[PDB]
Design a protein around this ligand. Structure first.
Ligand SMILES: C[C@@H]1CNCCN1S(=O)(=O)c1cccc2cnccc12
Lengths: 20, 353
């Protein structure tokens, strides 16, 4: 599922801005 | 047509009143922008209680004002680290913007000061925590719930853009929920006063507009793209473009393809296709009709914009609140004392703070 793909991305936590 | 005479006259008058409000708000902003405040408190006026958040910038602590007993959120920046990170202009800009703006969904700077080692910005304490945490916990927000938050962002960007401020940092991580369930926007380091175009690569991968990724000159329409990402993520529980690595996210963003959960309403999909529009000549918020294309869209037909501004709408969600100083809606962090050097650091660079 799309939700499963989201979990698989590893980007479910707080996301940093580019400069970091 | 779509509106009878009474409805059309009401909408026309409402849009004219917005213009009148914004003209006065710009006058008030420019007065404060030209004459900022400074040195309105000192460190031993506050007891430090708990760290609420950390970043490369420094940290934000819950503090209690001794004289009044009021709680506040105190942002502490290490001057030497700000310099090493090339963030002098951003830090001075954040403070200058915060002291000059005034809007019910923008956090209020109550005090600022500096000492030998650090810079301090003391803001009202917003006890409900980040939207991010509530969204991941609940999973997704209903369309009425997402719409209540979205309306506040639309009005906030309408205000900021009238002042020629581009925000550039929208995401659930950067939105707090207050005691009445309304939104507070806090971070202005990446905001810029630009009437025309600007060119800096900045933001968060999932929320970047295509024209930023493609290294173009861009304008305030990047904020309306980001609103589209935010509405999508609030209503789905995940953003429209994601992948293992940022370069793969960017390929998706620029492709012009977006897919929706089957539970999205047709009205929501129509709005999102017009906000997540790669073609700038077609993106809502960037057309002749301006913000009105968004505010008058069918998905917002039940929104009473004045009632949202006046905070008279009952919020769909009230965070848990046990009393002043309750920190249960924030994370736990390792505490670290704040040392003040006997020697002033970086005085020249921060002379305007
Ligand atoms: C995520 C937000 C924004 N990014 C920086 C870190 N913070 S914060 O530490 O929560 C924070 C910042 C500003 C004012 C605040 C007022 N009340 C509570 C917390 C506050």
């Amino acid at each position: 599922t799309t939700y499963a793909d989201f979990i698989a991305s590893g980007r479910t936590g707080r996301r940093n801005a580019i400069h970091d | 047509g779509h509106m009878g005479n009474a409805a059309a006259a009401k909408k026309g008058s409402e849009q004219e009143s917005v213009k009148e409000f914004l003209a006065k708000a710009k006058e008030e902003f420019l007065k404060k922008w030209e004459s900022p405040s400074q040195n309105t408190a000192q460190l031993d006026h506050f007891d430090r209680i708990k760290t609420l958040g950390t970043g490369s910038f420094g940290r934000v602590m819950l503090v209690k004002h001794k004289e009044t007993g009021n709680h506040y959120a105190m942002k502490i920046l290490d001057k030497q680290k700000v310099v090493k990170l090339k963030q002098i202009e951003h830090t001075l800009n954040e403070k200058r913007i915060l002291q000059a703006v005034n809007f019910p969904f923008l956090v209020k700077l109550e005090f600022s000061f500096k000492d030998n080692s650090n810079l301090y910005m003391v803001m009202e304490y917003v006890p409900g925590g980040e939207m991010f945490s509530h969204l991941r916990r609940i999973g997704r927000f209903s369309e009425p719930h997402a719409r209540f938050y979205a309306a506040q962002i639309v009005l906030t960007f309408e205000y900021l853009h009238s002042l020629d401020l581009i925000y550039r940092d929208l995401k659930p991580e950067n939105l707090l929920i207050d005691q009445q369930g309304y939104i507070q926007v806090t971070d202005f380091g990446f905001a810029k006063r630009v009437k025309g175009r600007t060119w800096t690569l900045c933001g968060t991968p999932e929320y970047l507009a295509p024209e930023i990724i493609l290294s173009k000159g861009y304008n305030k329409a990047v904020d309306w793209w980001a609103l589209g990402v935010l509405i999508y993520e609030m209503a789905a529980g995940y953003p429209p473009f994601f992948a293992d690595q940022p370069i793969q996210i960017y390929e998706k963003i620029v492709s012009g393809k977006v897919r929706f959960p089957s539970h999205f309403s047709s009205d929501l999909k129509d709005l999102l296709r017009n906000l997540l529009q790669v073609d700038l000549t077609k993106r809502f918020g960037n057309l002749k009709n301006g913000v009105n294309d968004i505010k008058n869209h069918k998905w917002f037909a039940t929104t009473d914009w004045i009632a949202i501004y006046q905070r008279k709408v009952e919020a769909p969600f009230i965070p848990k609140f046990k009393g002043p100083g309750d920190t249960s809606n924030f994370d736990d962090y390792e505490e670290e004392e704040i040392r003040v050097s006997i020697n002033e650091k970086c005085g020249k660079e921060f002379t305007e703070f």
